[PDB]
Every structure is written in structure tokens, then in C-alpha cells.
Symmetry: D2
Subunit: 344 residues, 4 copies
Amino acid sequence: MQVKLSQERAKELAENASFIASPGKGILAADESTGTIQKRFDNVGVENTEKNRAEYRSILFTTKGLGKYISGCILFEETLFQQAPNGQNMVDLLRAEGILPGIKVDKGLVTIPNTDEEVSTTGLDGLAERCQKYYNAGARFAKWRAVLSIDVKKNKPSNLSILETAHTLARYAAICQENGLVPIVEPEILADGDHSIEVCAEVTERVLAAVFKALNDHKVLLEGALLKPNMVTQGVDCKDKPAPQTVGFLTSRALRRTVPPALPGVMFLSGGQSESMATRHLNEINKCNKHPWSLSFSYGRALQSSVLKTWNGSMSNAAAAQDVLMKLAQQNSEASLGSLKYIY
Amino acid sequence: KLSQERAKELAENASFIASPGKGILAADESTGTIQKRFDNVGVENTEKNRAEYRSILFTTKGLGKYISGCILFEETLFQQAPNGQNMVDLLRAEGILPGIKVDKGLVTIPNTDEEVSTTGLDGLAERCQKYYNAGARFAKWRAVLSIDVKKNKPSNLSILETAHTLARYAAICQENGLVPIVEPEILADGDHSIEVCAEVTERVLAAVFKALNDHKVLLEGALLKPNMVTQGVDCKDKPAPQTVGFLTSRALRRTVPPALPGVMFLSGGQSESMATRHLNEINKCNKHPWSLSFSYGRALQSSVLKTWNGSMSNAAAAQDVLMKLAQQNSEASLGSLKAKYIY
Amino acid sequence: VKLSQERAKELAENASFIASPGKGILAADESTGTIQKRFDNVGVENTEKNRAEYRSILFTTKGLGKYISGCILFEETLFQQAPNGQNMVDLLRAEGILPGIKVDKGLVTIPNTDEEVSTTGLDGLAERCQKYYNAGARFAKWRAVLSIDVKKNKPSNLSILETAHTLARYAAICQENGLVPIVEPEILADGDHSIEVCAEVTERVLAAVFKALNDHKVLLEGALLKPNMVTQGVDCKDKPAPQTVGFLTSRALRRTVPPALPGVMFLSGGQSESMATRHLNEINKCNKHPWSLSFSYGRALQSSVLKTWNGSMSNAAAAQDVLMKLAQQNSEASLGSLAKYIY
Amino acid sequence: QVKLSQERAKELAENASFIASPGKGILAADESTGTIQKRFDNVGVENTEKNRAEYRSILFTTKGLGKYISGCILFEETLFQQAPNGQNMVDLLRAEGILPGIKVDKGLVTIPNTDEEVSTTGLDGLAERCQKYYNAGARFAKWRAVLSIDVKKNKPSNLSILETAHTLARYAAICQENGLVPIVEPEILADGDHSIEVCAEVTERVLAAVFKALNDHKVLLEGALLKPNMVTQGVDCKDKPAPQTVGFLTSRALRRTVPPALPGVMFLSGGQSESMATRHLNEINKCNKHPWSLSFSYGRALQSSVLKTWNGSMSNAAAAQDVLMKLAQQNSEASLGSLKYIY
């Protein structure tokens, strides 16, 4: 347990972060907790037993050739320590595909006092010890989700929300790096509400400027980190649908205006977007310019909805489910290279 | 989401704790801190012996004349004395508010030279609710900063982390019914001058109070527990107690808004006597808009423990010594104990 | 460049003098374009002779120094002679009143804001302060302006940041060159926001201002603040009690202003002569406070004086009596002797 | 107009990208009267307006200079000056295809209560000067801020950095409002005996602060340029690092802090020789692919030998111009990494 980051440990983080950011690859977010996976399984009539969770994840992680398109897979703690039905460790299934295991290390959201229901992410207590344990089990990257809301009538996100988001993300990132894990820094601005794409662009640029200043103040090594931001879109209830081209351009611009080139990758979240839109948008983001970091994906639902539906709880559909995962992984791989087959 | 009635309860309790002539007894030593002290009087460090010792403190007749609050460790808040009475009921019978330590300890900040962060925000609201239900009405959380001129400590990062985390802790406490004691302790370690301590103390407090504002902490329902301004432990200079009084007063006057009802000093490694004398001098040198009092552990208990010496034969004598130290610190809190520095 | 003990001592003595109990500041520092307006309203031609006459009548009011500790001038007046050839500065000395000087050069818009503003005048400020000190000035004034608009999120972060940073630079430069800075972050009462919103904004803005003053090493002991009172907006249909303005102003200040600051000298804005006085009185009555709570009034001390003079020396005596009446009542207000809001 | 329009943003972005054109850099010819004095003293030339006009005319009539030079920064005198044959200096630059630029700062003053750290002046009336300069043909501006490293005195102080970042951001925003691309120059001096590692750490901290401020002030990075120091050891440091190390650490500092939307980073060379300024630029470009141009804005490094060759005689003008072209050429090749990891 050492406090100052050494050249050798910085190097391992940098190499791992660059690997995860490999051109044409992205992240499979398979890190649903027991409560979250309950809803996904409810949607397809499948009972949420530990057995069914092991079966479903083993199907994902034995998808032949998945490693051609997936560089990392974020796990929930259960799955990181779990074996598949045939006795193989989940981590060893990932290794066999050439996929780095990752681990969700946050403990969920609580309300910030004297805000209108804005939130803080918990989990700093014991984080170093959890990181050490996860590293020893084979995890090489981590994930922590902060959440911000846009509400123009209520002046959201508040200063206090942004300040809390930035400080706490920076602490988590510094602690990860101290204990061998590449942090994925995730400041998710929700798309809830009826604000325009212009308001999202303005909010996203301010938020990211604060987040990167904080990472600098906390001595986070950007070479050994990744960003997982929202794309810049209109709100879910906004009546003005911009083109996917405008989403692409304003997302690229927000990032070009705020993200230093030393960061090796930006791995987008898809939020409530459909499988198709999540891919089309990533493609548009990449086509509109040359960028000094990889622009790729860290998708959960946008890689799994159709897969869950196809599996439908039966090993007889395992092969079919795996093919659906490969199609989605493949199209997102192409979208990350801008190859799917100025506003100041 | 702070309501008028919650704000009012906080303000009343904070003003009570800061009552003129009263201060805080800190009885919140962990099993591990208690160990060495019980070793020196030949007493086994068991739960029942800690209850025995603390029951002596909490049945001291008239202690509530000088003590407004007593900070407990969790064990003690839920504990019974040897005769089966709840420790919390003993404090209530004295007219003393129970308080509770809610932090979980110190960890090093990455990429600093051994500078520290205080842990305990995870689950804090729920701990506060449980402690409130058990009778606690104020909380304690300690942050630590170090001075080192050569290494530029305390670093910007130490100060930012300190201010931000204290403010989060203070906000959560207030949301859940407890008055937070905000304690940014600047250690006296090292050989720096009193003037360096003064400059650092003023900077740190400016940062702390700005963060409390940013987090919407109600000052009217909080208290501060700072270091006094003193030279470092290895400093060869020995400033007069009048100078400690003046520079401590100046540092607080320059930084602490008058809406805060009380400043309850920590004593650090100061002797029982010096802790009282410094407090007196701080109060003597000026009029102040907040109470300037004490929140003392060892500076109220060292001679008490030594007098008790592990035996109930000496309990009444030990109580007499506590009353003497409690009284002299009460008097000190009212300023009534019985080239040049810029204004 | 580094504040010496004697320089620091002179600043602190002069700031305490300006804040002397029962005294306030006459703001007589209307620029040419501003006094045009006041003179228009009473049919008087804006010539320099008329300005010299009018100001010389103010500054020869017998006994004015009993109520007025300081008088802020415009540059013209600081170097001007009254009609009989006496220097205006010497008239003020004969009254026992310290001269002060407005040292800002006006407002310009901050780019990419909705018409929010920055105050200009830092270029050559040290050399202006030196020249003004030599001519007799011992305090300075600089006005920053902020607006409240909840829908547009005014005042913006950029407005607050620019206001705080620039006021701190000005303050520090004044102190380096012998002048006590009056720090004036004026939040306008324009618009229809509630008094609660004004309270909240005023507290945020003062927290940012005092933090910046700390960051720039401004000596609070040798400075003064000139804030808005906390009032509802001009177009707000609430009409809170004068007691509420008193309570919320006192609260905002108690929550943010360290006691080392010797005085808070309010601006009156668009308030009437009587309301400016009544509000000051209520602010003082509702609590004890560690700084003077007094006045730095222009219109509120002069509108009736000007209307009585009406451009004729035959009314000089009458005009002076009116000035003494308004100075007196404000002197008395400064001593407080003329479901619910959170404590 | 106060809000930057799409068309005016577009003009700034096009001009900034042009200045950053691959293989081109900036001739910094913006020496003030007092600075050019010193340069002329080295070659025994009298500092008269005629000599300044003569020398600059020789620079600006160098045949083919615009193949290597995209922009030339002028001092105000020169912007409004005629060369000896009656042509405007600005027209000489236009004939070369070079954009005229203008220095808009008014020099350095000390920040109070620092150890001789400095603030850059010139915000007062900047908008109006920018307009007048634009009308005269200028399309970009420059403002120099200065920071010092001194590990024993903890320089650069927080105050130095805060002041530097805030004031640069104000200047940049005002330039953009009035049609000029701002060169943002936070120069960290190489004075002292600190290591290259200390310079790396300080540079990264300063740049992080500067870019956050630029964001807070709504500065359009697409229409701006950066002029930073290279990362080098101090002038009196006894360890000489490899040119490759300067290359790498400079790239790394920028990669860690400068968003890609900025089109160009145009280095200052400080005390470096003509050769070292070029070699270092080449190494910076060679060590990586970068999303902004890495080029030069050189004064002495493009001019020392030119001045020495000229020697105050028009009969050496052609020889002087050939020297300029040689140095312009080599720096052009260096800006493409074509001269002919530490975490």
C-alpha cells in the first residue's frame, strides 16, 4: 500500500487504459446489481436467481470472438467472484477472450442536503481496500457513476451539484490509481426534461471543465484514466428533434473544448437511447472530426436488451443470443471508428 | 431540506452547548486510545471497566454547572453503568447533552506527503438518525492538517479536501437532527513559529467557512473546534501566553462570522494548566461575538484518571478533581480565571 | 508592497474612526454626469461654480462632524476651492471630517453575459491613491454592481467571481498606498424578486467577497463594507415589514462578515430619506453586532438639502439645517435609537 | 455587441487557424520603447523613432518572409507608423501576406503582500483600444503575464496564479468581443536553480488554472492561441537535461492541460539562444502527434543575429534580411518536427 504513484505503476495504468481505448473496441457494461438485473429479467419473464445470473453472464462471456470488439467488461462484485455453470471463473472466461475485467466500486446515490433532490455518489469509505481486493481477483479498471440533472426553471445543475460531482469523482479516481485500477470517470448528465440540445451542450461543457480541473487538483494521471460522459442531446421531452449530425457535432465540440489529449479514451454512456440510436450517434460523433482520444462506447442496455430478449431464459437460445451480441458489438466497433456499414 | 423547526432545534441546542461559562467534556476515546491510559493505572481495558470509569465521570455532582455537552464514542452511547443505569440517562440527570463521534478515521490522500482525509460520509445520515434516537444532539468529526514550511504543507489539496468534507459532514448532520462540531485541527507538530501558525490558521478557516456557505450549513446550528494559535512543538521560541491569546483571537475575528454561537477549542498536547491559561488569555484580550470555550478530553481527565487509579475508593476524590478542572475552565471561558503583531 | 506595522496601524485607526459609533459617511462623490441629473431635477445649471457653491455649503455646515466621520468626494472636488478660495479638503478638516475619494472609473459590460458588469480603474490605481493621499484623502470608494434575475440565473457565477476578484485587488492596492478601502458590492433592487431571494443572493455574494479579500491579504481591520440592505425588489408585490428588512439584513451580515471588520456602512439605493433611516434603525435594533452598522448615504442625505438650496446662497442657512436634521436622524438610526424566516 | 455572434466567432477561428498554419509561426516585434532600448544598446544603436522605424522596415520588407511567418506582433507605435519610404508598416506586412498583431497590455506591477510577484495591467479602456487597433489592420493581440518559480519561497503563490488566470481570461474575452484573436501568454520565468521536474509541475498547474478561467469567462478556444514557456530547468540549475527531455516534458504538459479545440501553441523562447529555441521546438514536435500546431512566437530568437548584422546601417539591410530568412526557415521546419514516457 504506497501513497505516491511510482513510474512503474503509472505505466501499468497507462498501458491498461490505452488497451481499453484500443481503436475499434469498447466496453460491455455488465455491472447490473441484483436490484437492477431484477428489472431487466422481469422484462423478459426470467426469475432472478443467482443461477440465472450466472447462466446469463456465462453466455455473454463465452461469446466466441467477442474480444475482437470488446476491450473491457465492467462487472458487479458478485460476478467478479463468480463461477460459470461449468466451474470456470467469470474472470477466466474474460481473459480467454482477451477482455480486461472491470468492477463497479461506487455504493449508490444519496440526496445532497438543501438541494432540490440533487445527488452525491457514495463509496469512498473503504475504497482503497475494495480496490486492492478487486485487483487481486483480476479487475484492472473501475467505474463510479455521478449523476446531474438539467432543469432550467430550477437552475439545475446547481453549483453545489457540480462541485460535489467534481470533487468526489476526483477522489475516487485518485484512490483507484493508488490501488492499481484505471478509473472510468462518469459524470452523467441525465437527459430528463424538455431542455434543448443547446442547453445540454452548455451544461456538458461547464461540467467537464470542472471535472477536469478537479482531476488536476487531485493529481489524477489522465494517461491512466477514461471518461464516460453523456452525449450532447436534447432532453427526452424536448419537442425539437435535432439531426444525429448535430448530436455528433456538439458532442465532439464539447469534448474538444474540455478534454486534454493525454486522456486515452472517451467511452460514451447511451442512457435511454435505443440500440440503433446509440450506435448511429457514436458513428456521427466520430465522423465529424479528427480527435486525439478514442471515441467509443461503454454500453449496457444498448448491447444487451435484444440479447436478453433472445435468450429468454433458456440455454437452447444461447447460441442465438451470442450472435445478437456479436452483431451489436460489431456495429458499435464500426461506429467507434466512424465507419458504420461549425456552430460556435 | 432544512425546515424552520429543525433549524430552530439546531440553533437552540448549539446555543445551549455554547452557554456562557460552559464547555464540552470529550469522553470519546476509542478502545485503542483508552488502552495506554488504563495501562498506566493498572486497569484492564474491558467494556465493563470503561463503563465503570465513565460512570464515575457522569455521576459527578454538579458537573452540569460547567459542562454543557459530553462527546461519546458509540459504545458509550448505548452502554449501561455497573448498576444498570444507561450512561445517556446519567448525562441527562446532570443536565448535559450527549454528543457522538461520527467520523471513521483518517486515511492518506494520494500523491501528498502523508496528508490526510477523514472518512465516514457513507451511511452517515443513518448513523445520525440512530444516534439522535438514542439521545445524541450533537456530533463530532475531526480533520487534520500539518504545517511544514519546506514541504509547503498544508497543501492546497489538503485544505480543499478538509473544507469540502467538513462541509458535507456538517450538512448531513443538520439534515438529521444533530449539531455538527466542525473541527479542522492544525497540528502543532514541527518547529514553525507562532506567526506561521497564525497565517495557516486564518487561511484554513477562510476556506472552511466558505465551504460551509457553499454547502448551506446553518452556522446558527453549528460550532467550531479549532486549534489555538501557538508555536510548533519543536520551535525554540516560547511566546508569552498573552501572545497566544492575542493571535488566536485575531485569527478567529478575521474569519469566523458572528452567526456561529461558539468556538470550543481543542487543547492538543497542552498541559491541563496551559489549556486553561491560554483559554483565559484568549477571552481576556477582546470582546467576541461567539463564546470562546473548551472541548477538552485529556485536559479535563488526566488528573482524574490518575486520582481514581482503578479503584472505587478514590472515585469521590476523582470527581472532586474533575470539578476543579471543569470550574477553572468555566472561569477561563469567561476570561475570569482565579516590531509588533498587526491588530 | 508588503503592509508594514505602521501603515497597518494607520489604516485600522482611520477605519475605526470612520466607523465611530453614532457617525456615518456623507457620499458627495457624484460625477459630472450624475450631478447633472440631481441639478436638473431642481432647475439649476450644472456649472463648476454651481458645484463648488453647492459642495461648499454642505462642507461648512456647523457641527456636521458630530454626525459625519467621512465624506466621499469626486476627483474634481478633492482639488477644488470653495467660492472664497479655501480648499474643499480644508473645509472638511475644519469640520473634523476625513476626506475620501472615489477611485473607480465606472462600469463596462462583461462579455457573453446578459448585460452584467465589471468595474474599471485598476490601471494606475496605486499612483492615483498616492496623489489623493497627498491631497488629504484617507479612504477610498469603488462600486461594483450585481443584478438579481431568477429566470436568467443572475447574478451569474462570472458576475460574482469578477466582482469579488476585482474588489479584492482594489482593496489591496488602496491599503498598500495609504487609503482605507470601502468595499462596495451593490446588489441592485431592480426586478420583482422577493426579500428571501435578496437575502440568499446577498449572503452568497458576501461569502465570495470576504473569501477573495482573504485570498488577496486585505486587512479587514483597515477596511469597510458598503453593502445593499436586504429588501424585496422594486417591482415585488410583497411589502415586508421594516422589522423584516432589519432582521434579514442583520442575518445576512452575521452569517458572512468577520468581526475584525470595523464597520458596515450601508448604501440606500432608491429608498426615500425616511425609509433609509427607518431601515438602518431596524437593522440595529434587532441584535447586538460586532461591527458598526451605519450609513454611507448620498441621495438620502442630500435630496431635500438640494431642493431647499434651489440654487441660491440666500437659502444656504436653510439647506444646512436640513442637512443637520437628516445627518442627526441617521446618526440615531446607526445606534438603534431613532410560517417564518430562519434564524 | 456583447454576445459573440456566429459570424464574429467564425472570423476569430479562421484568423487563429491561419496564424497556426502548419509550418508557420509568429515574429514577435512588439518590444516597447524601453525594451528596444536594451536591444539597440547591445549593437550601439541610438533609440530614436527613426531607428525603430528603419529597423522594423527592414524586417517587414524581407522578401518571402510570409512563407514562414503567419503573423507579426507589433507595439502600438509601429502599428501606426510609416516606414522611411512613406508606406505604412501594416501595408508592408500585408504585402508579405502576414497578419498584423498588437500588444495590448500596459506592463507589470507588483501584487501587494507578495514577494515581488506581478500583475499585468491594461484592462481599462481595452475594448476601445482593440477597436482602434482592428480598424488599423490588427487581427490578433498579445498580453504577457509573468510568474516566478522559487521553491524556498513557495513561488508561484496561489495569489500569483489566481491573478494571472483571471486577468488573462478577462483580456481574452474582451479581445474576442472586439474582433481580435487573443494570444494568452502565461510566461513562467526560467530564473533560479530549480529542476526541469519543478518546471513541469508548475507549468501543468498554471495551465490547468488558465484553461479553467478561460472556460469560466466564456473564451472561445477556437479563436485563441496559447504562448507558454517550454518546460526547462532553471537558468542556474546545474543539471542540463537532454533536448529530448525538454521535448517530451513540454509536449506532456500541454497534452495534459490544453483542449484540442485550441488551434495553436506558439512558444516563447525566453533566454534561449537562437539555436536552442529551434532545436527544442523540433524535439517538442518530434516526440508525439498533437491536435494543435506547435510553433513559435519568437522575438530575440528571430532577431539577435539580425540586429548584430544590421549594426545600425542601411548598407547591411540585405545581409540582415538573409539572416532573418535563415532563422525563420529553420523555425518553420522545427514547427513541423522536420529540422534539417515519464509519468
